[PDB]
Amino acid sequence: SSVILTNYMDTQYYGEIGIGTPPQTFKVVFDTGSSNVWVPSSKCSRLYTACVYHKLFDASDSSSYKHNGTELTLRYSTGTVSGFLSQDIITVGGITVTQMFGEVTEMPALPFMLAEFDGVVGMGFIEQAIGRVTPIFDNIISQGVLKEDVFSFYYNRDSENSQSLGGQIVLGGSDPQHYEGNFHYINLIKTGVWQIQMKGVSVGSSTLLCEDGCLALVDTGASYISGSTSSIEKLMEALGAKKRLFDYVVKCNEGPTLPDISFHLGGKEYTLTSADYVFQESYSSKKLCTLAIHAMDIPPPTGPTWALGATFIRKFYTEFDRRNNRIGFALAR
Numbered sequence: 001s002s003v004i005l006t007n008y009m010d011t012q013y014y015g016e017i018g019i020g021t022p023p024q025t026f027k028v029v030f031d032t033g034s035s036n037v038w039v040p041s042s043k044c045s046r047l048y049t050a051c052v053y054h055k056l057f058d059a060s061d062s063s064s065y066k067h068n069g070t071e072l073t074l075r076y077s078t079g080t081v082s083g084f085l086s087q088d089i090i091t092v093g094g095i096t097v098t099q100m101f102g103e104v105t106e107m108p109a110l111p112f113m114l115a116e117f118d119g120v121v122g123m124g125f126i127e128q129a130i131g132r133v134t135p136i137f138d139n140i141i142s143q144g145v146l147k148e149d150v151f152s153f154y155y156n157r158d159s160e161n162s163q164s165l166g167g168q169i170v171l172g173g174s175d176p177q178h179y180e181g182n183f184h185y186i187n188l189i190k191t192g193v194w195q196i197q198m199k200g201v202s203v204g205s206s207t208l209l210c211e212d213g214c215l216a217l218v219d220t221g222a223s224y225i226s227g228s229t230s231s232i233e234k235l236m237e238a239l240g241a242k243k244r245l246f247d248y249v250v251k252c253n254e255g256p257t258l259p260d261i262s263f264h265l266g267g268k269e270y271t272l273t274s275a276d277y278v279f280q281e282s283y284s285s286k287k288l289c290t291l292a293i294h295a296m297d298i299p300p301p302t303g304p305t306w307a308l309g310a311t312f313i314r315k316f317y318t319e320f321d322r323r324n325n326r327i328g329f330a331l332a333r
């Protein structure tokens with residue numbers, strides 16, 4: 001099954017899922033970086049403006065709802081949400097599964113007031129699941145209906161017209177229509193996390209980073225490519241970028257000429273061009289242009305680690321192989 005995704009400003013990719021009976025619709029991000037499912041709850045106080053602006057699941061309207069109530073808190077690198085567990089049936093592109101999810105009652109204005117999506121569907125392993133809740137993909141696998149024990153991601157480049165699909169997730173395989181050439185796999189450092197060994201990072205013709213090796217979390221839920229603060233400072237220094245509060249800018253007229261950035265993964269160099277990582281919104285030297293690469297210190301046990309997000313997947317179609325505990329990459333088409 002494939003799920004059509006909407007692309008919002010190249011930073012948000014989300015699709016629809018149905019919860020309850022009758023189905024209550026929600027826009028959600030499919031996140032390989034987390035392992036829980038959650039949507040805003042009707043029990044979320046309207047004092048949380050984010051709840052006033054998103055779809056709210058109302059258990060009292062679903063006949064398939066099963067109460068639980070265990071509280072849980074989900075912590076992401078850029079924000080936190082809190083609530084309680086509930087069980088109901090969920091629709092994901094034709095597949096139906098009974099799933100335990102979180103009803104969020106505390107949704108911070110910053111950053112959720114900036115979210116086009118309502119919730120999140122974690123595609124990670126149960127090892128990282130908060131409350132030890134069985135992840136949705138595991139429940140799907142349990143049905144023995146998927147052709148293959150894998151899921152893939154396609155994140156299109158932003159578009160000014162509504163004729164192009166923002167992206168696409170495939171449960172059970174990959175869509176040959178959105179990649180070309182062959183997949184090149186890398187084994188997961190360890191099952192339980194969509195993280196792989198990265199052999200090196202280069203800026204221009206000089207592998208000046210991640211020498212001696214480092215970690216790379218392949219995170220479909222992250223908007224950008226991130227690295228430790230030290231790594232980024234070094235990388236950004238080589239680009240001549242200026243560190244801002246939340247990001248890094250560069251004189252727009254300078255954007256088109258920034259050097260290539262490569263990521264050495266499993267014996268293959270994955271190269272991004274300035275066009276691939278800078279939001280080229282102008283060529284003016286009197287304006288600043290943001291880079292789709294940020295600094296982010298991911299704490300243990302998962303980090304320190306670099307994170308390959310939308311900026312990376314936009315260029316390389318990505319297959320997540322559960323059965324073989326490896327990740328596949330192929331040039332996106």
Ligand SMILES: CCc1nc(N)nc(N)c1-c1ccc2c(c1)N(CCNC(C)=O)C(=O)C(C)(C)O2
Pocket residue numbers: 011012013014029031032033034076077078079111112114115116120219220221222223310
């Ligand atoms: C999708 C959940 C999520 N998972 C992971 N692994 N890391 C995160 N930083 C986030 C996370 C949290 C809050 C967010 C966003 C992401 N995102 C990006 C969502 N990612 C995609 C690919 O759409 C946002 O835009 C704002 C609103 C800041 O709020």
Ligand SMILES: *[C@@H]1O[C@H](CO)[C@@H](O)[C@H](O)[C@H]1NC(C)=O
Pocket residue numbers: 067068069070085
């Ligand atoms: C919630 O689900 C977990 C999973 O087994 C269970 O242990 C717990 O008792 C449930 N909570 C309630 C009271 O429904």
